[PDB]
Amino acid sequence: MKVRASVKRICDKCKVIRRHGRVYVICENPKHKQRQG
C-alpha cells in the first residue's frame, strides 16, 4: 500500500473515509471509488 494518489473526492457527492494513516473514497458514482494508496 503506497499512499501517493489524489484520492480527494472527485464530484460533489463523493466522500473520503479516514483509516489507519490511510484514507478512502466512496461515492454513488462508481468511477470515484478509490483508496488513498
Q: Which residues bind Zn ion (CB under 5 A)?
A: 10-11, 14, 27, 29, 32
DSSP code at position 13: S
Q: Smallest distance, Å, CB 4 to Zn ion?
A: 20
Distance CA(15)–CA(35), nearest Å, equals 11
Which C-beta is closer to Zn ion: that of 21 or that of 30? 30
C-alpha cell at 32: 470515484
Beta carbons within 10 angstroms of residue 18's beta carbon: 9
Q: Smallest distance, Å, CB 25 to Zn ion?
A: 8
Binding residues: 11, 14, 27, 32
